[PDB]
């Protein structure tokens, strides 16, 4: 029964399978409202932008999603709950390319972009609500599985080091295939911490931050790709939050670019990651040392409490 | 002929000693105006606060300083210039304890402090104007000396590493005398950079930042004072600015204190340092990793240009 931005993830008495209906009935109430808020979002978009064929397509997806959800009858038994899970799965799949479609749509509407903020905000709101929905949906679905150390999508004993390492491997491979090598990554600080945490956010953010740190490093060592500065990550775990600092020695972010780094370039990783972090009660801050490198600070608040 | 916040430091053709009069006549025009602005500052202070005997004393010092400066006749020859230097030296000495007097005065007026901002701002404005005056005064006086690599207070080839080391030594001694030991300090990055720079700001800021980093380290290793984590400093020198990052592993600044750290506690080092940095076109940012340590970023803009 953890919490987030009005979203609530349930953890309850299985056996009877009663917990699945209390969760499903909640998911059934919540999804329509969140889908509706996004539809309003598309309705308030500047006419010229909302007219773009692609944007107009994504808008129709939200409308059709709202219809299917509103058409489903109230969950009364485990029989309905099961079918409702099928609807939800169809939706997540139907909206798998929403973000790609938006980028394409907004890119084409770049010439008409008058207000710079009312686009950064539209993408923030769209990407986050989409994360909140995926977390709510995925959690309920996960309540049907029985993985060890997981109550839905909530890991009861997550290891920041473990998850960071997973993505380090992922990121290093993409890097080697692209440059012939990749920076090793050292991890210090609270390397042995373990606590209840929802990995999903970290599953998106970390690989975005790790690819950036590794790229900057390679792009600034074109003369010695076979010998580059390590990327150093530090884990700070306290009762209020989890802090992961990712430091690279890739030259830093030039003064002339310090602004456009956090904007979308249909570069989505950094702006999306900050949105995600802020949506969850955390933050994403950059410290640039021009000529040397960059320090990125990812802060995420702990699960409805304080643990280490 | 370098620049700053409307302040201008002169560098010119000696020999004739003509450069000393063009500088003196400028210093003579500038000091009264800056002293006057501060007097207005004391006049706009809330009556209850400005009534404190001590605060009232400091206020009288500014008034008497303004009088002496306004009484001095226009500099016409090297003879006047020389005497004017004597006036200036008397002033800097008469106002040597201004800050200590203010703290004492404001501390006593703590009960009456209604507005929290209009005090932080009064101390900012008082401490900075005081720095700007000391830089203007000291520079002109320094134009009489003939030190190597110095045009007044402007060092023509300052070494951040060199100046940092000087203060590391200073800070380590105070630390050992207080704890029996002190963290070693490693310095990386652009350790060989050299460029025109005014050391004064760094002469105050660095020892304040270095004492904090060393203190936090000792206070969080009371069980092993003989073996503590190094303090690590990184120098980033580019064409726009000089960045000195000071990282300690002293536990960081607790969430509950993150606000009061940048306030005055009549703790003056951090708030004064940020004021100084901002006054000079730079900044002072803190990144706290609760449970691990703190990273402090000092940024100072280069002398009327771009060098490395
Ligand atoms: Cl269009
Ligand atoms: Cl999704
Ligand atoms: Cl890559
Ligand atoms: Cl530790
Ligand atoms: Cl009083
Ligand atoms: Cl002074
Ligand atoms: Cl000390
Ligand atoms: Cl280097």
Swiss-Prot record, chains A, B:
Signal peptide: none annotated. One of its GO terms (cellular component) is mitochondrial matrix. GO terms for biological process: branched-chain amino acid catabolic process; isoleucine catabolic process; L-leucine catabolic process; lipid biosynthetic process; regulation of acetyl-CoA biosynthetic process from pyruvate; regulation of glucose metabolic process; spermatogenesis; valine catabolic process. Mg(2+) binds at residue 212. Expressed in heart and liver. It is found in: Mitochondrion matrix; Mitochondrion. Residues 92-304 form the Histidine kinase domain. Autophosphorylated. It catalyses: L-seryl-[3-methyl-2-oxobutanoate dehydrogenase] + ATP = O-phospho-L-seryl-[3-methyl-2-oxobutanoate dehydrogenase] + ADP + H(+); L-seryl-[protein] + ATP = O-phospho-L-seryl-[protein] + ADP + H(+). Disulfide bonds: none annotated. It comes from the Eukaryota. Keywords: Acetylation, ATP-binding, Kinase, Mitochondrion, Nucleotide-binding, Phosphoprotein, Transferase, Transit peptide. Serine/threonine-protein kinase component of macronutrients metabolism. Forms a functional kinase and phosphatase pair with PPM1K, serving as a metabolic regulatory node that coordinates branched-chain amino acids (BCAAs) with glucose and lipid metabolism via two distinct phosphoprotein targets: mitochondrial BCKDHA subunit of the branched-chain alpha-ketoacid dehydrogenase (BCKDH) complex and cytosolic ACLY, a lipogenic enzyme of Krebs cycle. This is Branched-chain alpha-ketoacid dehydrogenase kinase. It comes from Rattus norvegicus (Rat). The gene is Bckdk.
């Amino acid at each position: 029964v953890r919490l987030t931005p009005t979203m609530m993830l349930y953890s309850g008495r299985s056996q009877d399978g009663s917990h699945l209906l209390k969760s499903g009935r909640y998911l059934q109430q919540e999804l329509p409202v969140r889908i509706a808020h996004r539809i309003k979002g598309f309705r308030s978009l500047p006419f010229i932008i909302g007219c773009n064929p692609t944007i107009l397509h994504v808008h129709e997806l939200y409308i059709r999603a709202f219809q299917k959800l509103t058409d489903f009858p109230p969950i009364k038994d485990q029989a309905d709950e099961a079918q409702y899970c099928q609807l939800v799965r169809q939706l997540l799949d139907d909206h798998k390319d929403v973000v790609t479609l938006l980028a394409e749509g907004l890119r084409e509407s770049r010439k008409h972009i008058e207000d710079e903020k009312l686009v950064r905000y539209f993408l923030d709101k769209t990407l986050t609500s989409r994360l909140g929905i995926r977390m709510l949906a995925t959690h309920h679905l996960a309540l049907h599985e029985d993985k060890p150390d997981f109550v839905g999508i909530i890991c009861t004993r997550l290891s920041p080091k473990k998850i960071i390492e997973k993505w380090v491997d992922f990121a290093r491979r993409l890097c080697e295939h692209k440059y012939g090598n990749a920076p090793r990554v050292r991890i210090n600080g609270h390397v042995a911490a373990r606590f209840p945490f929802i990995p999903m956010p970290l599953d998106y953010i970390l690989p975005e931050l790790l690819k950036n740190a590794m790229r900057a490093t390679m792009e600034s060592h074109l003369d010695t790709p076979y010998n580059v500065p390590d990327v150093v990550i530090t884990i700070a775990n306290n009762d209020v939050d989890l802090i992961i600092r990712i430091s690279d020695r890739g030259g830093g972010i030039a003064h002339k670019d310090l602004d456009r780094v956090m904007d979308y370039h249909f570069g989505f990783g950094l702006p999306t990651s900050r949105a995600y972090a802020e949506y969850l009660g955390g933050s994403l801050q950059l410290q640039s040392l021009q000529g040397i490198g960059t320090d990125v600070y990812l802060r995420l608040r702990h699960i409805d409490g304080r643990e280490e």
